[PDB]
Enzyme design. Structure first.
Site, short mmCIF file in Angstrom:
data_model
loop_
_atom_site.label_atom_id
_atom_site.label_comp_id
_atom_site.label_asym_id
_atom_site.label_seq_id
_atom_site.Cartn_x
_atom_site.Cartn_y
_atom_site.Cartn_z
N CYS A 147 34.90 63.23 88.13
CA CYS A 147 36.02 62.62 88.85
C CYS A 147 37.15 63.60 89.20
O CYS A 147 37.35 64.61 88.52
CB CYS A 147 36.59 61.44 88.05
SG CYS A 147 37.29 61.87 86.44
N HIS A 211 28.06 77.72 77.98
CA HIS A 211 28.86 78.42 79.00
C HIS A 211 29.20 79.86 78.63
O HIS A 211 29.12 80.74 79.49
CB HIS A 211 30.11 77.61 79.36
CG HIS A 211 29.82 76.18 79.70
ND1 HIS A 211 29.28 75.80 80.90
CD2 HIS A 211 29.98 75.05 78.98
CE1 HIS A 211 29.13 74.49 80.92
NE2 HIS A 211 29.55 74.01 79.76
N1 NAD Z 1 37.17 65.71 85.38
C1 NAD Z 1 35.85 65.90 85.42
O1 NAD Z 1 35.08 65.50 86.53
C2 NAD Z 1 35.15 66.55 84.26
C3 NAD Z 1 33.77 66.36 84.14
C4 NAD Z 1 33.15 66.49 82.90
C5 NAD Z 1 33.92 66.82 81.79
N2 NAD Z 1 35.27 67.01 81.90
C6 NAD Z 1 36.05 67.35 80.69
O2 NAD Z 1 36.95 66.31 80.36
C7 NAD Z 1 38.15 66.83 79.82
C8 NAD Z 1 39.36 66.21 80.53
O3 NAD Z 1 39.16 66.26 81.92
P1 NAD Z 1 40.35 66.01 82.98
O4 NAD Z 1 39.77 66.25 84.32
O5 NAD Z 1 40.98 64.70 82.70
O6 NAD Z 1 41.39 67.19 82.61
P2 NAD Z 1 42.64 67.61 83.54
O7 NAD Z 1 42.69 69.08 83.67
O8 NAD Z 1 42.59 66.95 84.86
O9 NAD Z 1 43.94 67.10 82.73
C9 NAD Z 1 45.20 67.72 82.85
C10 NAD Z 1 46.15 66.97 81.94
O10 NAD Z 1 46.33 67.65 80.70
C11 NAD Z 1 47.65 67.51 80.23
N3 NAD Z 1 48.28 68.83 80.06
C12 NAD Z 1 48.05 69.95 80.83
N4 NAD Z 1 48.81 70.96 80.37
C13 NAD Z 1 49.54 70.52 79.32
C14 NAD Z 1 50.47 71.14 78.49
N5 NAD Z 1 51.04 72.26 78.92
N6 NAD Z 1 51.06 70.42 77.47
C15 NAD Z 1 50.74 69.09 77.27
N7 NAD Z 1 49.81 68.48 78.10
C16 NAD Z 1 49.22 69.18 79.11
C17 NAD Z 1 48.41 66.72 81.29
O11 NAD Z 1 48.52 65.38 80.88
C18 NAD Z 1 47.54 66.83 82.52
O12 NAD Z 1 47.63 65.68 83.33
C19 NAD Z 1 38.11 68.34 79.99
O13 NAD Z 1 37.97 68.93 78.72
C20 NAD Z 1 36.88 68.62 80.83
O14 NAD Z 1 36.17 69.75 80.37
C21 NAD Z 1 35.89 66.88 83.12
#
Ligand code: NAD
Length: 393
Positions: A147, A211
């Site tokens: 997503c 990875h």
């Molecule tokens: N999004 C995907 O399609 C995808 C797919 C498979 C797995 N994942 C895994 O899922 C997990 C979460 O994914 P996501 O896309 O929601 O992550 P993301 O990178 O989109 O989330 C970012 C969020 O992290 C928080 N954040 C960032 N920096 C910060 C800081 N300085 N201090 C406090 N909070 C902070 C904030 O709330 C921000 O909105 C990841 O570990 C990723 O590896 C993601």
């Protein structure tokens, strides 16, 4: 009413909030402690409804519209009375969310890492102290969906949803809402959730080495000379890297077996070979996966071509919130993991961090990891139960 708190503000948090608040009978509160992201979310949403666009694989698209009760940075409002607390953020943010929720979490709270992923339970036990044995801890293997946010606070896109998904559980003394079905209901029909036998199984089955191993396979003894363009990631692995992955997967079984021998009543039999894992042979299974087509290495522009971009979540997350945690478990089990060790040592230097030195968790940045020993869990039973040994007198 099933009261749910979603922690985070990224892609997953948008999707979960959207999909969860659409369910009948559910109250969703969004907690985010990243500066004033909650205030930015609320102002961006306004009076409108949050939108989730799902590609059905394949049934074109679907419009899902819902509004959470409140989106706040105040943990008191979001965590008080919350039946389910779901963390959907990169693991580095997890510390802060546990710290903020601790004085407000109720005994019967189900605490979910979505993801997650490694040392999540050790960190929870540490921060929540005495209350950690009361609550239930649930760790999902990955994010339910591929997503991305299309418009902040307002719109998120699900490119695809997983068929199956596994989650582990450490039951507390409190009766929570039913973990598997409540989480299912929130996610709808897909992905179909299964309960893994043990939390250490989940932790080891995360395959933290993958990875780092793929990056080591393509850039191991890299001379310091560029390449025409970004080489294929998974589909661009060599045979030796497929062997490297098998080696590390066997080491995973070794740690699993040794835990099972030393600690009866802990079932780690679903810790698998990486080839045997799916959901010809390993090499061809990776390279001829249509789920890996056109996925390329992280690259940056340099002299005479492109160089590998080592400043990425493949190492900044997967080492300290993955491999180190598995190394911490390996040490406690009494199982040397040389292939895993070599990967840790290499990926270490590439990101300017240090966790492992001469097979011992004494590195400069070991405090920013989630290895059991960082929190004082030095024995297997301390790893399993969360109780530190106290002798008298
Ligand atoms: N999004 C995907 O399609 C995808 C797919 C498979 C797995 N994942 C895994 O899922 C997990 C979460 O994914 P996501 O896309 O929601 O992550 P993301 O990178 O989109 O989330 C970012 C969020 O992290 C928080 N954040 C960032 N920096 C910060 C800081 N300085 N201090 C406090 N909070 C902070 C904030 O709330 C921000 O909105 C990841 O570990 C990723 O590896 C993601």
């Amino acid at each position: 009413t099933v009261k749910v708190c979603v922690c985070g503000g990224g892609n997953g948090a948008h999707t979960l909030s959207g999909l969860a608040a659409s369910r009948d009978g559910v109250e969703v509160r969004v907690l985010t402690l990243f500066a004033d992201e909650a205030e930015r979310w609320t102002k961006a949403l306004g009076a409108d409804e949050l939108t989730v666009i799902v590609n059905e694989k394949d049934g074109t698209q679907t419009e899902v519209k819902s509004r959470p009760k409140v989106i706040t940075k105040d943990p008191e409002i979001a965590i008080s009375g919350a039946d389910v607390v779901i963390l959907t953020v990169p693991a580095f943010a997890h510390e802060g969310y546990f710290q903020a929720m601790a004085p407000y979490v109720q005994d019967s709270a189900l605490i979910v890492g979505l993801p997650s992923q490694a040392g999540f339970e050790f960190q929870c036990r540490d921060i929540l102290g005495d209350k950690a044995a009361a609550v239930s801890m649930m760790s999902f293997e990955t994010l339910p969906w591929a997503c991305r946010i299309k418009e902040f606070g307002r719109k998120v896109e699900v490119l695809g949803t997983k068929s199956v998904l596994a989650a582990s559980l450490i039951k507390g003394t409190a009766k929570t809402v039913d973990p598997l079905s409540t989480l299912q209901m929130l996610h709808g029909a897909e992905p179909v959730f299964r309960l893994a036998k043990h939390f250490l199984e989940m932790l080891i089955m995360s395959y933290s080495f993958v990875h780092p191993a793929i990056l080591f396979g393509r850039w191991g003894s890299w001379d310091g000379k560029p390449v025409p363009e970004a080489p294929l990631f998974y589909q661009g692995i060599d045979q030796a890297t497929a062997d490297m992955l098998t080696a590390c997967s066997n080491e995973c079984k070794d740690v699993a077996n040794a835990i099972m021998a030393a600690c009866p009543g802990n079932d780690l039999s679903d810790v698998k070979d990486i080839y045997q894992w799916y959901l010809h042979d390993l090499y061809h299974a990776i390279t001829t996966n249509k789920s890996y087509k056109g996925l390329v290495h992280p690259v940056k522009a340099v002299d005479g071509g492109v160089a590998p971009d080592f400043g990425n979540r493949y190492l900044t997350e997967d080492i300290p919130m993955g491999m180190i945690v598995f190394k911490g478990v390996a040490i406690a089990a009494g199982v040397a993991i040389p292939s895993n060790d070599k990967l840790i040592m290499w990926a270490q230097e590439k990101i300017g961090k240090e966790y492992l030195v001469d097979g011992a968790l004494t590195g400069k940045d070991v405090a920013t990891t989630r290895c059991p020993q960082r929190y004082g869990f030095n024995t297997l039973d301390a790893i399993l139960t969360g109780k530190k040994h106290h002798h008298h007198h």
